[PDB]
Structure formats: structure tokens, C-alpha cells
């Protein structure tokens, strides 16, 4: 049976030296962007604070979490599992497994 | 119209894209060359009924209508058969608003997969600017 993950990392955590590691974030939608084959929902969990990048990309990501951005709203409290990834411009996202959605606003 | 590489980076210097929003002129001509090969006609179509339009390849869900596509909101209040043009006015501007948007060119899934983090100067190097 499924259940949410327990948050792992606060969004201030998430570090370009955590590439490579699996981390559940949680908190609300900062922001949404739709550019087609790449979307992303930024998360906070703090007032004035971080607002980590967790990017969706066709043939990468798994079809059922493009199901589950299409309900995502700003506001709505989620619980995101990724893979911290660091940018390659070297400055940090996730790129996730799992988006379990709280509660909309 | 295909364009050659040194010719799309003097267009697009000419059309304010060097330094926008950080991004310098290398950015942009890698970007157009690994989403639409230099070609402004451009056009594929995704299996979620949208379509990428032109030299940037922008999506037809939120940034340009073309009138066929579910939920658009036509951001860049433009038909996306005007970012087909062999001018790259209309591209540019809404590509600006895009990259604008909050998450700077990460918008572009070919800039992300081959230009982020590389030598993007290389792609205007030896060209008369």
C-alpha cells in the first residue's frame, strides 16, 4: 500500500552538493511554467525563502507525474520525491519520482 | 529559411537577444540550433495535442495560439503561424517573455539537454557581430 514520504530536506537544504541524492521535499507551489516538452513546479516552505526547481520532461519523466502536474495549482501543499541535480552551468533542482498532492487551496 | 550560424547571431544581437535576462548571444544560437536546426519553418507536433512553432520552437499550449490546441492561453498574443516567418521578429519577442517567465532558458528542453553548462561562446566565435 502507498503512503506519502516523510520530507527529508527543507527547500533551503536542497545544494548543487547533494547531486545525485534522492530527497523528499515539502511545502506549497511557489510557482508553475508550461513550456511544452519542459515543465516545472517550484516549491516553498518558507515565507521569503527558497523556492526549489522540480522540472518535469517529456520522454524522461514518467507520464503519470505529467497527469499529476495538470492538477497542480499555486498554493497546493504537495510532498515531492526526486533526485537532487545540479546545473550544469555551475544551480539546483529535482528531478521527481513521486508528487503526492496534500491538499488544494 | 535555414540560416547559417553566424548570420542568425548577428540577427539575433540585432534583435536585443545578447545579455537578455543574463543569457549571453552564444546561449540563443545554440538554442536555435538544437530545436529547430536554424530552420524558421520549423514546426512538430507533441502528444499531448500541442505543437512548437519556428526557430525556438515555442509550444502552442501557453505562449502562441494556433488554434487547434486545448487551454491555450497565448501569452505572447501572437498566431504561432507568425513565428514561422523568415524575419525572427516575432519569435524573439516572445521568446523574451518566455525567458521572462521565471525559470530563464530553462524553458527550452534542447537548450537544457546541449547548450546549459557548455561552451555556448563557441557558437558566435569567428562571427563578424
Same mark, same amino acid.
Given at each position: 500500500?502507498?503512503?506519502?514520504?516523510?520530507?527529508?530536506?527543507?527547500?533551503?537544504?536542497?545544494?548543487?552538493?547533494?547531486?545525485?541524492?534522492?530527497?523528499?521535499?515539502?511545502?506549497?507551489?511557489?510557482?508553475?511554467?508550461?513550456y511544452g516538452r519542459?515543465?516545472?513546479?517550484?516549491?516553498?516552505?518558507?515565507?521569503?525563502?527558497?523556492?526549489?526547481?522540480?522540472?518535469?520532461?517529456?520522454?524522461?519523466?514518467?507520464?503519470?507525474?505529467?497527469?499529476?502536474?495538470?492538477?497542480?495549482?499555486?498554493?497546493?501543499?504537495?510532498?515531492?520525491?526526486?533526485?537532487?541535480?545540479?546545473?550544469?552551468?555551475?544551480?539546483?533542482?529535482?528531478?521527481?519520482?513521486?508528487?503526492?498532492?496534500?491538499?488544494?487551496? | 529559411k535555414?540560416?547559417?550560424?553566424?548570420?542568425?547571431?548577428?540577427?539575433?544581437?540585432?534583435?536585443?537577444?545578447?545579455?537578455?535576462?543574463?543569457?549571453?548571444?552564444?546561449?540563443?544560437?545554440?538554442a536555435a540550433?538544437?530545436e529547430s536546426n536554424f530552420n524558421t519553418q520549423a514546426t512538430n507536433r507533441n502528444?499531448?495535442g500541442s505543437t512548437d512553432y519556428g526557430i525556438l520552437q515555442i509550444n502552442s499550449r501557453w505562449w502562441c495560439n494556433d488554434g487547434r490546441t486545448? #487551454?491555450s +492561453?497565448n501569452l505572447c498574443n501572437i498566431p504561432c503561424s507568425a513565428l514561422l516567418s523568415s524575419d525572427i521578429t516575432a519569435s524573439v519577442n516572445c521568446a523574451?517573455k518566455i525567458?521572462?517567465?521565471?525559470?530563464?532558458?530553462?524553458a527550452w528542453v534542447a537548450?537544457?539537454?546541449?547548450?546549459?553548462?557548455?561552451?555556448?561562446?563557441?557558437?558566435?566565435? #569567428?562571427? +563578424?557581430?
Open positions: 500500500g502507498s503512503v506519502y514520504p516523510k520530507k527529508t530536506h527543507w527547500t533551503a537544504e536542497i545544494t548543487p552538493n547533494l547531486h545525485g541524492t534522492e530527497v523528499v521535499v515539502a511545502g506549497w507551489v511557489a510557482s508553475l511554467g508550461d519542459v515543465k516545472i513546479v517550484k516549491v516553498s516552505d518558507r515565507e521569503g525563502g527558497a523556492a526549489v526547481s522540480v522540472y518535469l520532461e517529456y520522454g524522461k519523466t514518467p507520464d503519470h507525474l505529467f497527469k499529476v502536474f495538470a492538477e497542480l495549482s499555486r498554493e497546493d501543499v504537495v510532498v515531492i520525491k526526486g533526485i537532487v541535480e545540479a546545473s550544469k552551468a555551475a544551480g539546483v533542482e529535482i528531478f521527481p519520482s513521486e508528487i503526492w498532492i496534500l491538499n488544494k487551496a | 535555414v540560416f547559417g550560424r553566424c548570420e542568425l547571431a548577428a540577427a539575433m544581437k540585432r534583435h536585443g537577444l545578447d545579455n537578455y535576462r543574463g543569457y549571453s548571444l552564444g546561449n540563443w544560437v545554440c540550433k538544437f502528444t499531448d486545448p #487551454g +492561453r523574451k525567458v521572462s517567465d521565471g525559470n530563464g532558458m530553462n537548450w537544457r539537454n546541449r547548450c546549459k553548462g557548455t561552451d555556448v561562446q563557441a557558437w558566435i566565435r #569567428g562571427c +563578424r557581430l
